Amino acid sequence: SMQDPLADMLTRIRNAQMAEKTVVSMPSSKLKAAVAKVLKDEGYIADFQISSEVKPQLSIELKYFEGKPVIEEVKRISRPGLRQYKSVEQLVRGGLGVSIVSTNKGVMTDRAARAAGVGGEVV
Amino acid sequence: LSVEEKAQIVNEYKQAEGDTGSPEVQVALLSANINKLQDHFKANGKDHHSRRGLIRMVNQRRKLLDYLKGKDVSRYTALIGRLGLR
Amino acid sequence: NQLVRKPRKRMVDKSDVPALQNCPQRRGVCTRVYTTTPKKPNSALRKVCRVRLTNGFEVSSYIGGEGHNLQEHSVVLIRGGRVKDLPGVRYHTVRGSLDTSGVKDRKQRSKYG
RNA sequence: UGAAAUCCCCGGGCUCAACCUGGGAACUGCAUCCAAAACUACUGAGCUAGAGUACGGUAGAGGGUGGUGGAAUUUCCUGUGUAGCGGUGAAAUGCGUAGAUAUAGGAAGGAACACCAGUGGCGAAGGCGACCACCUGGACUGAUACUGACACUGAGGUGCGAAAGCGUGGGGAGCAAACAGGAUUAGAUACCCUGGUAGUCCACGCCGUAAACGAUGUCGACUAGCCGUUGGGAUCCUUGAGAUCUUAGUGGCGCAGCUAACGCGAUAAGUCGACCGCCUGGGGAGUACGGCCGCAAGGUUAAAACUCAAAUGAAUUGACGGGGGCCCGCACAAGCGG
Numbered sequence: 001s002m003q004d005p006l007a008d009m010l011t012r013i014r015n016a017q018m019a020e021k022t023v024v025s026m027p028s029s030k031l032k033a034a035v036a037k038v039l040k041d042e043g044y045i046a047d048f049q050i051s052s053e054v055k056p057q058l059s060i061e062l063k064y065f066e067g068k069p070v071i072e073e074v075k076r077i078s079r080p081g082l083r084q085y086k087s088v089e090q091l092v093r094g095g096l097g098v099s100i101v102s103t104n105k106g107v108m109t110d111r112a113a114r115a116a117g118v119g120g121e122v123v
Numbered sequence: 124l125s126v127e128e129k130a131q132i133v134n135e136y137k138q139a140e141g142d143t144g145s146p147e148v149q150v151a152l153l154s155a156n157i158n159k160l161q162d163h164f165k166a167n168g169k170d171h172h173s174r175r176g177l178i179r180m181v182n183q184r185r186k187l188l189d190y191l192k193g194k195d196v197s198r199y200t201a202l203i204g205r206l207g208l209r
Numbered sequence: 210n211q212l213v214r215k216p217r218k219r220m221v222d223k224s225d226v227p228a229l230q231n232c233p234q235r236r237g238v239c240t241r242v243y244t245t246t247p248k249k250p251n252s253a254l255r256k257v258c259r260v261r262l263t264n265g266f267e268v269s270s271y272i273g274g275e276g277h278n279l280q281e282h283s284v285v286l287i288r289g290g291r292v293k294d295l296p297g298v299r300y301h302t303v304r305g306s307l308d309t310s311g312v313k314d315r316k317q318r319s320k321y322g
Numbered sequence: 323u324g325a326a327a328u329c330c331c332c333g334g335g336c337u338c339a340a341c342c343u344g345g346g347a348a349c350u351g352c353a354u355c356c357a358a359a360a361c362u363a364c365u366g367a368g369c370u371a372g373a374g375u376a377c378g379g380u381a382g383a384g385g386g387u388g389g390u391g392g393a394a395u396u397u398c399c400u401g402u403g404u405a406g407c408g409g410u411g412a413a414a415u416g417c418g419u420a421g422a423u424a425u426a427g428g429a430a431g432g433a434a435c436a437c438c439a440g441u442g443g444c445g446a447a448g449g450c451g452a453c454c455a456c457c458u459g460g461a462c463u464g465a466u467a468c469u470g471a472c473a474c475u476g477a478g479g480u481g482c483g484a485a486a487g488c489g490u491g492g493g494g495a496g497c498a499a500a501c502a503g504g505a506u507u508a509g510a511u512a513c514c515c516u517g518g519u520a521g522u523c524c525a526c527g528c529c530g531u532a533a534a535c536g537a538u539g540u541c542g543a544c545u546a547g548c549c550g551u552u553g554g555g556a557u558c559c560u561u562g563a564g565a566u567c568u569u570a571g572u573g574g575c576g577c578a579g580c581u582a583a584c585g586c587g588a589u590a591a592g593u594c595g596a597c598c599g600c601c602u603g604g605g606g607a608g609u610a611c612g613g614c615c616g617c618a619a620g621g622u623u624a625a626a627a628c629u630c631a632a633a634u635g636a637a638u639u640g641a642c643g644g645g646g647g648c649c650c651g652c653a654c655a656a657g658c659g660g
Contacts, residue, residue: 002596014593018593021545026543055370079596083362139468144469145470168386171385175459210596211597
């Protein structure tokens with residue numbers, strides 16, 4: 001069955017950055033599909049517009065950042081054992097746009113004290 | 124299996140009349156069909172391709188009962204006291 | 210999860226020097242001293258000594274001199290090291306618990322003018 | 323709390339350095355306590371998108387039990403009839419005071435179902451082809467109503483598994499391991515011929531294996547197109563001779579991407595996820611020994627000693643072929659001569 005929904009975000013995003021698709025819609029959920037808010041605050045804007053009533057599908061407005069897209073590699077999820085539960089030992093790839101974090105209080109990255117979760121990089 | 128058998132096994136397991144889908148009705152529709160097919164496989168014992176459609180009905184009933192037992196044992200004890208199960 | 214339920218077992222590597230069990234040298238006694246012929250590209254008449262080692266093991270050692278005198282019950286030390294031509298030998302008789310002789314002058318294991 | 327030494331950074335003493343030493347850091351750990359509540363737990367209530375139920379409607383070699391057919395082979399009777407059996411890389415066995423391939427004929431018996439037949443269909447796989455009836459499984463499909471995560475996978479386990487084999491009993495046309503001859507060849511133990519018992523067929527029981535293959539685990543989500551086809555459905559001026567989109571299958575190309583290459587490419591070998599099985603150089607070897615299973619044949623689980631520096635994949639150039647296609651020359655035979 002389908003049993004990792006935010007790796008299905010990051011794959012529907014990735015396969016449409018791999019195409020030249022403008023918009024990705026997907027029936028995804030609360031705060032870990034305000035992973036999408038983090039990913040398209042730090043990053044760019046979208047409309048991003050979670051929009052229905054009882055099948056609330058969110059629609060990332062991907063855009064193509066001149067020539068070839070800015071998402072090169074995203075996924076890096078955890079679902080079992082694939083995992084980040086870190087205490088700062090978390091990603092630093094260029095030290096930039098770093099890594100969505102998915103735990104106990106609020107989805108953010110690298111600004112406050114500590115407490116890791118999981119996601120993956122813009123570039 | 125018949126049209127009027129399957130309408131009447133619905134009728135005494137209903138639980139809020141529009142219902143045909145509760146695990147009461149489904150276990151009762153399965154248990155009746157399992158019993159009536161046991162006549163077939165005494166007479167037709169070489170039919171393995173239809174045993175598999177029966178073993179699917181046994182396993183579909185066991186999952187529905189494990190569902191209902193973990194969820195509401197009062198509906199489980201009443202259903203198991205009907206149907207001659209366990 | 211498959212790794213958690215049985216982990217990755219590392220493969221042991223056996224010694225290619227089975228006799229002299231984790232020892233650098235190990236003396237024996239020469240059962241028989243003889244010559245055998247090399248593997249297919251090579252040709253010589255190379256002196257071996259079948260030695261019965263003091264572990265009860267019984268191996269064939271090479272005599273790497275330019276002429277020796279290990280006379281059929283000598284008390285050689287052997288050491289590890291295969292001789293690629295001779296099929297099925299794995300050891301060298303060291304040269305200097307019994308005999309060393311010759312000229313060698315470009316030495317060990319040798320004699321000393 | 324993690325002893326001290328050690329290790330490490332900064333110093334001090336050894337004539338320098340080993341070494342000795344002070345102080346720090348580190349000991350990534352552990353337990354307790356206090357706080358937070360993005361998230362994979364748990365507890366309470368929900369929701370309908372996964373999954374299942376009711377209801378029509380088709381399509382199908384899905385299965386099981388019986389029965390009925392028709393074509394052909396063989397073997398039997400009876401009729402008509404007269405020398406034979408110029409297969410093939412080449413001939414040898416069954417026939418005429420016993421009629422010889424054989425009739426325009428009849429009967430019996432098994433066994434397989436031409437045409438339809440289709441990169442067609444159905445089934446979990448193995449598989450399943452005549453027709454009709456009965457008993458039955460699953461899919462596909464259309465709307466509507468219901469249940470409300472009931473799901474996915476699956477070590478063990480337990481079922482079902484081509485063929486051939488194996489008991490035990492029917493059956494026995496045709497075909498035919500074994501085997502008899504007859505050829506062919508140094509031989510021929512074979513390929514060819516003429517026969518032909520097991521077996522193939524039916525019933526019940528066993529085995530449990532195959533190049534059991536798509537050499538590709540199952541489930542789910544996403545990612546350019548074009549051309550067929552099967553079962554549905556819906557829209558299209560509509561005659562359909564039809565057309566378009568939509569689903570579930572089955573195929574042919576091919577963009578991205580991946581790949582060692584070949585190639586795969588919405589039926590992924592792409593992009594990801596959940597779980598399982600498996601692999602670790604070639605031989606030894608899927609073999610010994612043990613255990614389990616089998617009536618047996620044997621299966622399954624499964625090594626080491628020893629041995630060698632390799633085996634192996636895919637593509638490239640050549641050479642070669644009792645591979646194919648083109649082409650040539652007194653190469654093939656016209657009015658030469660040992």
